[PDB]
Design a protein around this ligand. Sequence first.
Ligand SMILES: *[B]([O])([O])[C]([C][C]([C])[C])[N]C(=O)[C]([C][C]([C])[C])[N]C(=O)C1=[C][C]=C(O[C])[C]=C1Cl
Ligand SMILES: *[B]([O])([O])[C]([C][C]([C])[C])[N]C(=O)[C]([C][C]([C])[C])[N]C(=O)C1=[C][C]=C(O[C])[C]=C1Cl
Ligand SMILES: *[B]([O])([O])[C]([C][C]([C])[C])[N]C(=O)[C]([C][C]([C])[C])[N]C(=O)C1=[C][C]=C(O[C])[C]=C1Cl
Ligand SMILES: *[B]([O])([O])[C]([C][C]([C])[C])[N]C(=O)[C]([C][C]([C])[C])[N]C(=O)C1=[C][C]=C(O[C])[C]=C1Cl
Ligand SMILES: *[B]([O])([O])[C]([C][C]([C])[C])[N]C(=O)[C]([C][C]([C])[C])[N]C(=O)C1=[C][C]=C(O[C])[C]=C1Cl
Ligand SMILES: *[B]([O])([O])[C]([C][C]([C])[C])[N]C(=O)[C]([C][C]([C])[C])[N]C(=O)C1=[C][C]=C(O[C])[C]=C1Cl
Ligand SMILES: *[B]([O])([O])[C]([C][C]([C])[C])[N]C(=O)[C]([C][C]([C])[C])[N]C(=O)C1=[C][C]=C(O[C])[C]=C1Cl
Ligand SMILES: *[B]([O])([O])[C]([C][C]([C])[C])[N]C(=O)[C]([C][C]([C])[C])[N]C(=O)C1=[C][C]=C(O[C])[C]=C1Cl
Ligand SMILES: *[B]([O])([O])[C]([C][C]([C])[C])[N]C(=O)[C]([C][C]([C])[C])[N]C(=O)C1=[C][C]=C(O[C])[C]=C1Cl
Ligand SMILES: COc1ccc(C(=O)N[C@@H](CC(C)C)C(=O)N[C@@H](CC(C)C)B(O)O)c(Cl)c1
Lengths: 174, 181, 172, 175, 177, 180, 174, 172, 178, 174
Amino acid sequence: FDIYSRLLKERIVFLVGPVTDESANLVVAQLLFLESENPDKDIFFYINSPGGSVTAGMSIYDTMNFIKPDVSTLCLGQAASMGAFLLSAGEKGKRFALPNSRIMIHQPLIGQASDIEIHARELLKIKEKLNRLMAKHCDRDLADLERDTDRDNFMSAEEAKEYGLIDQILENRA
Amino acid sequence: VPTVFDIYSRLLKERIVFLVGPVTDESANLVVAQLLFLESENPDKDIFFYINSPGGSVTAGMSIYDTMNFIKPDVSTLCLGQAASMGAFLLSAGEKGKRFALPNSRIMIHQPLISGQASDIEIHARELLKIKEKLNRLMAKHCDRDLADLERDTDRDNFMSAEEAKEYGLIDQILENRASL
Amino acid sequence: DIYSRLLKERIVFLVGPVTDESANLVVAQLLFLESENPDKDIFFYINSPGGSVTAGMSIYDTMNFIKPDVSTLCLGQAASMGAFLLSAGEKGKRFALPNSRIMIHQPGQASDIEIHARELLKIKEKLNRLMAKHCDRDLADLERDTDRDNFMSAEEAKEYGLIDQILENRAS
Amino acid sequence: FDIYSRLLKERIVFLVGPVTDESANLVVAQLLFLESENPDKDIFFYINSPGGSVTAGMSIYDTMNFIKPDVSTLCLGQAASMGAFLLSAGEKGKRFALPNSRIMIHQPLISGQASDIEIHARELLKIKEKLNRLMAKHCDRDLADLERDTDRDNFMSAEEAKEYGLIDQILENRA
Amino acid sequence: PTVFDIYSRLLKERIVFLVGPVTDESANLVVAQLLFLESENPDKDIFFYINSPGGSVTAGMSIYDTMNFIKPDVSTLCLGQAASMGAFLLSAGEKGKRFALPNSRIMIHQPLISGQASDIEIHARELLKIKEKLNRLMAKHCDRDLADLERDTDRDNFMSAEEAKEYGLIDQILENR
Amino acid sequence: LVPTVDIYSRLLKERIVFLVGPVTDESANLVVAQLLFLESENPDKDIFFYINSPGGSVTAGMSIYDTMNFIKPDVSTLCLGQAASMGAFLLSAGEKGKRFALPNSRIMIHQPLISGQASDIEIHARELLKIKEKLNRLMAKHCDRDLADLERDTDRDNFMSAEEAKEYGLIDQILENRAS
Amino acid sequence: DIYSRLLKERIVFLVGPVTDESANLVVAQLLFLESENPDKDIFFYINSPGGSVTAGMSIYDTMNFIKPDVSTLCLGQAASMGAFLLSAGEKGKRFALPNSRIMIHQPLISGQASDIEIHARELLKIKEKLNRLMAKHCDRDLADLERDTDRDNFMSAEEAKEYGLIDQILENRA
Amino acid sequence: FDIYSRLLKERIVFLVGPVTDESANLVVAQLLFLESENPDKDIFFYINSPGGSVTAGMSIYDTMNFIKPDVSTLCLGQAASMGAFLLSAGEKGKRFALPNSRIMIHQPLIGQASDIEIHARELLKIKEKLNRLMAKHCDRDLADLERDTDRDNFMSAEEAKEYGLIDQILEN
Amino acid sequence: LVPTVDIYSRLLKERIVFLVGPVTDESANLVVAQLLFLESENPDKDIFFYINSPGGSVTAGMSIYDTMNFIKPDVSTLCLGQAASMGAFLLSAGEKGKRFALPNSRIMIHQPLISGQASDIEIHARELLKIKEKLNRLMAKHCDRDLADLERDTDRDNFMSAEEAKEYGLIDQILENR
Amino acid sequence: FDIYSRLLKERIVFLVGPVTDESANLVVAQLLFLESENPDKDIFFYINSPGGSVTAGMSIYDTMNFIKPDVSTLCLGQAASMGAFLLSAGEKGKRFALPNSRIMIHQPLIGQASDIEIHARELLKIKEKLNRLMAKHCDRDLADLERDTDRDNFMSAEEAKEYGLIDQILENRA
Ligand SMILES: *[B]([O])([O])[C]([C][C]([C])[C])[N]C(=O)[C]([C][C]([C])[C])[N]C(=O)C1=[C][C]=C(O[C])[C]=C1Cl
Ligand SMILES: *[B]([O])([O])[C]([C][C]([C])[C])[N]C(=O)[C]([C][C]([C])[C])[N]C(=O)C1=[C][C]=C(O[C])[C]=C1Cl
Ligand SMILES: *[B]([O])([O])[C]([C][C]([C])[C])[N]C(=O)[C]([C][C]([C])[C])[N]C(=O)C1=[C][C]=C(O[C])[C]=C1Cl
Ligand SMILES: *[B]([O])([O])[C]([C][C]([C])[C])[N]C(=O)[C]([C][C]([C])[C])[N]C(=O)C1=[C][C]=C(O[C])[C]=C1Cl
Ligand SMILES: *[B]([O])([O])[C]([C][C]([C])[C])[N]C(=O)[C]([C][C]([C])[C])[N]C(=O)C1=[C][C]=C(O[C])[C]=C1Cl
Ligand SMILES: *[B]([O])([O])[C]([C][C]([C])[C])[N]C(=O)[C]([C][C]([C])[C])[N]C(=O)C1=[C][C]=C(O[C])[C]=C1Cl
Ligand SMILES: *[B]([O])([O])[C]([C][C]([C])[C])[N]C(=O)[C]([C][C]([C])[C])[N]C(=O)C1=[C][C]=C(O[C])[C]=C1Cl
Ligand SMILES: *[B]([O])([O])[C]([C][C]([C])[C])[N]C(=O)[C]([C][C]([C])[C])[N]C(=O)C1=[C][C]=C(O[C])[C]=C1Cl
Ligand SMILES: *[B]([O])([O])[C]([C][C]([C])[C])[N]C(=O)[C]([C][C]([C])[C])[N]C(=O)C1=[C][C]=C(O[C])[C]=C1Cl
Ligand SMILES: COc1ccc(C(=O)N[C@@H](CC(C)C)C(=O)N[C@@H](CC(C)C)B(O)O)c(Cl)c1
C-alpha cells in the first residue's frame, strides 16, 4: 500500500496543488471512505493548495459538512483561495495551521452581451456567497469579508487565527 | 490512486459511481459499464451516482441516460460541485424521488451547443433543432413542469443554486448531512 | 492610384474589418473631403462585416460632425458595425445594391468584470438607441431584432428604415 | 479483474468511439474469446460508434457472421456510419436500439498521378456499392433505396431505423 | 513590370482582372476599377477577365451589382477557369458579350461553409436563402428554369467551353480575334 | 495602404496630428515629431491633436505630454472613438478651454499597469508607485480636481461618457458638429 | 527595372512556378505587347517546373488568342506545364538553349465518394485533353503521348527536338 | 520492495530535484510515516536539491520541527537555496554535508499598481522572515544574513561548517 | 508609415537627431550617419540629439559616444520620456552646458546586464568586468562625481527624476517651455 | 524482477547515459542498499556515460568512498567527462575498462555583472577542484591534468591505463 494508502489509515487526507475536478473528487472519495469505515473518528485534512475550481472546491466543502466524522483541517505550505476556504471550513475548534504557513483570501477571478451579463451576475453571486460563508467560518461581519477579500489578502497563521479563519497554531505535538 | 483495492473501487463496493469532469464517449461508457456492473451485482438495490460535471456530448450522455431507467436498479443521483448542461440533464434524469444536490452545488441548464454544402448544413442544423426540442421535452418531463418553461429558460445559460433547482424540479431534496433526512 | 482617383470623385471606401487604422483612415479621408469642399456630398462605400465599436464610433461622430452630407452605399454586405454605419448615412441618401445583405446583432477580479460587463451593457443600449433613431424605430424593437443575428435583404432593410432606397441601375 | 473483464464474464463487448484498426481488432478478439469460453450462448455487441475505417469494421463484420454464437447488437448513444452498419448486421431478430439512441447512414466520406487517383476512386465507388448492397440485405430493403438514402447523412431514430429494417426492436426497461 | 504597372496599362484598355479567390480585397479592387472606367468614359465597353476559383459570396456580389449599375456594358472573358463565383460573374456579363477561351473550364456547385442551436438555425436558414437566390439568378443568366439549376448544381458540375456556351453561361467561345 | 493626394501628410498642415492605437516609443515619437514640425512652420497657430488610442507605455505617453507643454502653439485635443488610460491622460492635457470630444467617444482612466531578485522587484515596484502618484497629481491638475478624487476614481477602470468626462474636468466641451 | 526594359524588346519571361498570379502577369504582358504592336513577334522565355493547369491554360489560350506569333525559348528547364507551354509557341519558332532540361508527365495532385467520382472523372478529362493538345503540338500520335507521359519523362534539348516539342536548339547567335 | 522503499524502511528520506508542492508533500508524508512508525528514532534526510518553491519548503520545515524524531540532514551533490534552508533546519548537532557537496544561499527571486504593491510587500516579508530564521539556525546576526544573501553566495562544505550552516562534514 | 511634408528627414534639416528605442547596430549606425552628415553640412552649428531609449548594446552605444566626441559641433542632448541604461549614458555624454530633459522624463542607470568551457567563461567575464568599470569611469567623469559614487549607485537599477538627474550631474538643466 | 534488479542482486549498479540528479541519486540509492544488504561484499559500478551534472556526479562520488565496500568501476563503451571521473573514482586497484571502450576528459563547460562574476568565479573553483581530484585519482602532476584538460582528450582503455584513470583492461573471463 503506497505511502498515502497507509497515511489514509490514520485518517489523514491530503490536498496538494490546485483544486481541480479530479483532485477535489479524489479528496471527496477519500472522505467518504474514511467515514464508511468509521463515521465517528475524526478525519484529518491536510491542505497545501493555491486554490482552484470553485465548483471543485465546493464538492469537497459540502462533503465535509455532509459526513458525520469531524473534519480537522491543517494548513501546511499554503492555503490560498479555495484552499484557504476549505481550511476555514473545518469543524470549529478543529482548524489549524503550521507556524510558518500562509493564508491568502481574495474575491474570485477569471458570447453575446446577454450571456456576458448572465455570467457576470452569476460571478458576483459567487463573490457574495463566498463572502458570506467565509464570514460564517470566521464569525465576522459580512462587511469584514467583502472589505478583506477585495484584493490579495495574505496572512501569517497568527493573522488567520486572530481573523478567526483557524482555531490554533501548532508548532508541534505539545 | 491510493490503494485500500483502490479508492474509487472501494467506493464502487458501496455502489458509488462517479462522473467527474465533462461528458465524453470515453467517460460516458465507463459510467455505463459501472452501472451495468452494479446491476449484474445487485439488480435490486439502489445505485448511487455522483455528478461533478460541466456537460458534454449529447449522444454520450444519452447512452448513460438509457442505461439508467432500462436497468431495474434505481439510480439515485447526487450533484456535487457542479452539474451543468448534460450533467444537469442526467441529474434530473435520476429515479424520481432520488435526485439530490448538496447545499452549495451549482446547476446550470442551456440549449445544445456546437463545437460543407448548403445541403449538409441544412441537414445537420435541422438535426440539432430536433435534438434541442427532444432535450427540452425530456427535461420538462424530469422537472415535472410544462415545456414552455424549458424552452424559455434554456435559451441562454440558466444557473441555479441547490434550492432553485429543487423548486424547478431538477432535484427533489437538498442534504446538509445525513441528519437532513 | 485607383482609390485616390475615386477619392477625387469624393468616394470613400470601407472594406472589411472596422479597425483603429482603417476607421481612422476613413476619418482622414472624411476630413480631407470637407477640407477640399465643405459643401459637396461625400459618398461612403461600405462592404464591411463589422468590427471594433469605438473604431466605428470615431467614424460615426465624424460623419455627423463634418459639414458635408455623407451618403452611404452598401455593396456585398454591411454587418454589425457595417450595418450601423450604413444606417448612419445622411437621411434620404442611404443606399444599397439589389443583392446586398444587411445584418444587425447585439455586441481580472470580479470587481473588474463587473465594471466591464456594466460597460458592455451601456454600449449595447447606446447602440440600440442610436440605431432606433436612425431607422426611426422603437428601442424595444431594436432590442428584440438585434438579440440574435438578424439577416435582411435590401427590401427588408428598407422597410425596417435602415436604408432609404435600393439602387438597381442609376435610375433612382 | 477490471470492470471490462468482469463485464466480459457477461459476454458483453463494446465498440466505443471511432473504428480504427486496433479498436476494431480488439472487438474481434473479444468476440473470439467468448466463442472459445462458450460457443453457444449469444454475444451481445454494444455499439456507441460514430463510424470510421471501413476495413477495420469489415474485420468485425466478417467476424460477427463467422463465429458460431449468435451476435446481438445494441445501439446506445449512437450508431453512425459504420457503427450503423455493424449494428445492422447483428444476428437477425437480435438487433436492438435503446429508446433515445441515434442512427445515421451515409455514403462514404474520405478526407498522386491521374492513374493513381483513377485506381483509388474506382476502388471507393466499388466500396460504396458493396456497402449499400449488404445494408439492403441487412434491412430487407431494396438496394436502390440504400443508394438513395445514403447520398447524404440520413439520420434516423431507433424507431425509424426499426422501420427501415436496420434494427428489430427498441428496449425501454428490463421487460 | 512598369509600363504605371502592367495592369494599369491594360486598364488604359478598359481591361479589368479577377485572378484568384474572390476576397473582399480583390472584390473591392475590381469594383474600384469598374467605377474608375465608368468615370473615365461611361459608354465604352469594359473588359472583365476572370480566372478565379470563387470565394466570398458577398464579396462577389459587390462586383455583380457594380456591373449592372455602371453604364458600361461589362463583357466577360473566362481564361483558365471560372469556378463557383467565377462562373457566376462570368455568366453575369452583358448578354451577347460573354466569352471563354477554348480550353477554359467552368464549374458550378452549390454554396459551402466551413455556437448555439438558435444561432446555427439562423445561419443555416440564411445559407438556404443564399442557395435559392443564387439558383434563381443563375437560372436567369443561363435562361434556364430554376429546377434545372437546382438539379445541375447539387454537387460539382464541371463544364467545357462547349458545355458552358450551351448552358447559356457564356455567349461565344473565342479561338482568336 | 494610405492613399496619396499621403492623406495624413495632407492633414498635417491643417495642423491636425493623429494618435491612433497603442502609445509606443515609435508612435509617440512620431507625434512628437509632427508637433515640432507644426511649431516650426508656425509657432503661433493652434495644433489639433486628435486621439483614438487605448493607451500604452507611460514614458512614451510622457513624450507627447511634455512636448505638448513645451511648444508655443496651443495643443487643442479631441477624442473620437476612445481615449483610454494614457490616451485619456493626454486628452485632459490639452490647452484648457480647447479639450473636446465627439458625442459617442469613450474615455476611461485607471491606475498604472504591468504585464528578478527581491531587491530588484523592490525597486521596480517603488518606481511604479512614484509613477502612480505622479499620474494622479498631474491628472488632478488637469481636471482641476482634488488628488484624492483621482486616487479614488482610478483604482479600477473608470469609463466616462463625454458628458461625464466633461463634468470631471478632463475635457472642456462636447462637439456634435461645427455649430458647437 | 531590367524586366520592363526587356519587355520593350518583346521578351516575356516565366520564372519559377506558374500560379494564378504569375500566369496572369504573363497573360497581361502578352496583351500589352499585342496592343502596343500586334504585328511583331513576342519572345516568351520559360524557365519553369510547371504548375496550375488552369493558370497554364490561361497562358496557352492567350498565346493562341493574340495576333503576334509567340516564339518560346527554354533556358534552364521547362517541366510538366512549362514544357507544355514551350511546345505551344508558334510552329517553327519553338527553341531551347543547348543545356536545357524538358520534362513531361501526366497530371497529379499532392470529400464524398459521389463528389470524389465527379472530381476523378474531371481529372481524367483534363489528362486526355492535355495529351491531345500536346500531341498536336508535337505532330505525334495521341497514344505516343499517353505512353510517354505515364511517368516523368526527361528530355535533353536534343531529345525535345526529336520528339516534336521544339524546332531549333540555339547554340550561339550564329 | 523497490530500492527507495527498501531504503525508506530504515528512516532514509530523499528530497531530490526541485522543491515543488508535490516533491515536498512526498517527503512530508514520509516524515509523518517514519514518526508513526517510531517518534523516538531519528530520521535521516538526504538532500540533493537546487531549491524550489518557498511554501513547499516551509511545509517540510515545519513538518521537520513539529514531529518528535530529530531530523538529521545530509547534503549530497548540492543543497541550494531552499535545499540549504531545510539542511540548516535539521536538528542542531545533526546537520551534515558530504566533502564535495556545495551549498548556496541567496535572497528570494521570482496586474495593476495596487496588486503589484501587495505582492511586493509579501515578498519583502518572506525575505525578512527567511533571513531571521537563517540568522538563528547559524548563530548569526540578522545583519549577516541580509548582507551575505544579497546575491548568490557559494559555500564549500567547510565554509558552511564555519557559518553555522551545518555541524560536520563527513569523509568515510 | 511616416508622413512626408518624410518628417524625420525634415527635422534633420533642423539638426534634430533622434534615438528612439533600443540601441542596436543598425539604429546606432543610423545615428552615426546623421552626426557625420550634419558635421559636414555645417560644423559650426549645434546638433540636437533627442533620446527616448531604454538602452541597448554597449559597442553600438560606444560608436555613438565616440562620434559625439569626435566631430566639431556641440552635441546637445535632450531626454524625452526615458533615457535608461545606455540612453542615459548618451544623454550624460552631451556637451557640458547643453544637456537637458523634459520635466516628466525619467532617467535610469545600472550596472551592465547580460542575457562554453570554463576558460572561455572566465575570459568573457573579465571583459564584462573591465566594461563595468570603464562605464563607471566615464559616467563619474560626465557627472563630475567621484568614481565610488557611481560604482555604488549602479549595482542595481537607480531610477531618477529630471531634478534628481540634474543633482547627480547627469544633465545641466530642465526645460518646461523655451 | 526486472533485469536490472536481478543483476543488482549480484551487486551490479549501472550508470548508463547522462548524469542527471535523478539518475545519479538512483545510483546513490543502489550503492546504499547494496551496503545494507552486505557491507563485506564489493560493488560493481558499470559506467557507459558521457557525463552530466557535475553536482550529481559529486553526489555519487562522495558516496563511493564513504560506504564501506570497495566500489569497483568498469568502463564499457565509453566514459566521458563525469562518467570518466567516476570511473577514475573506483577503488584504487579496481578500476577496469573493456578493450573497445574509451575515455574522454575535458574542462567544465556550459544576469547582472556582479552575478556573472560570482558564477564565473564559482565555475573556475569547480575546475580547480576537479583538476586536483583528478591528479589524485591518477597520481600525475596537476600541471599535466589541467594542461591535459584544456579541451577534449580522448583515450583508449590502454591510454587510460597508462594515464592512471583505470588499472586493468579485460579481454574475457580468463
Ligand atoms: B482561488 O484562487 O482557487 C479562487 C477561489 C476563491 C474565490 C476562494 N479561485 C477562483 O476564483 C477561480 C480562479 C482560478 C483559481 C480557477 N475562478 C473560477 O474557478 C471560475 C472560472 C470560470 C467561471 O465562470 C463563471 C467562474 C469561476 Cl468562479
Ligand atoms: B451541454 O454543454 O452538455 C450541451 C448539451 C445540453 C443541452 C444537454 N452540449 C452540446 O450541445 C454539444 C456542444 C459541445 C459543448 C460538445 N453539442 C453536440 O454535441 C452536437 C453536435 C452536433 C450536432 O448535430 C450535428 C448535435 C449536437 Cl447535440
Ligand atoms: B463512415 O464515416 O463509418 C464511413 C463508412 C460507412 C459508409 C460505412 N467512413 C469512410 O468511408 C472512411 C472515411 C473516414 C471518416 C475514415 N473512408 C475510408 O476509409 C476509405 C478510404 C480510401 C478508400 O479508397 C482509397 C476507400 C475508403 Cl472506404
Ligand atoms: B464558390 O465555392 O466560391 C461558392 C459560390 C457559389 C457557386 C455558391 N462560394 C460559397 O459558397 C461561399 C463559401 C466559400 C467561402 C467556400 N459561401 C459564403 O461565403 C457564405 C456562406 C454562408 C453565409 O451565411 C452565414 C454567408 C456567406 Cl458570404
Ligand atoms: B494605460 O493602460 O495606457 C496605462 C496608462 C495610465 C496608467 C495613465 N498604461 C500602463 O499602465 C502601461 C501598461 C503596459 C502595457 C506597459 N505601463 C507603463 O507604461 C509602465 C509601467 C511601469 C514602468 O516602470 C515600472 C514603466 C512603464 Cl513605461
Ligand atoms: B506539371 O508537374 O506542373 C503538371 C502539368 C501537367 C503537364 C502534368 N502539373 C499539374 O498537373 C498540376 C499539379 C501540381 C503541379 C499543381 N495539376 C493541377 O493544377 C490540377 C489538378 C487537378 C484538378 O482537378 C480538380 C485541377 C488542376 Cl488545375
Ligand atoms: B531558492 O531559488 O529555492 C529560493 C529560496 C531562498 C534561498 C530565497 N527560492 C525562492 O525564492 C522562490 C522563487 C522560485 C524558486 C520560484 N520564491 C517563491 O517561490 C515565492 C515568491 C514570492 C511569493 O509571493 C508572491 C510566493 C512564493 Cl511561493
Ligand atoms: B543597458 O541595459 O543599455 C546596458 C548599458 C549600461 C547601462 C551598463 N546595456 C547592456 O548591459 C547590454 C546588454 C543587452 C541588453 C544589450 N550589454 C552589452 O551590450 C555588452 C555586454 C558585455 C560585453 O562584453 C562581454 C559587450 C557588450 Cl556590447
Ligand atoms: B562533462 O561534460 O560531464 C563535464 C564534467 C567534467 C569532466 C568537467 N560536465 C560539466 O562540466 C558540467 C556542464 C554540463 C554537463 C551541464 N558543469 C556543470 O554542471 C555546472 C557548471 C557550473 C556550475 O556553477 C554555476 C554548476 C554546475 Cl552543476
Ligand atoms: C470592455 O468594453 C468593451 C467591450 C466591447 C468592445 C467591442 O469592441 N465590441 C465589439 C466586439 C468585437 C468586434 C471585438 C462589437 O460588439 N462589435 C459589433 C458591433 C455592434 C453591432 C454590437 B460587430 O461584431 O462589429 C469594446 Cl471596444 C470595449
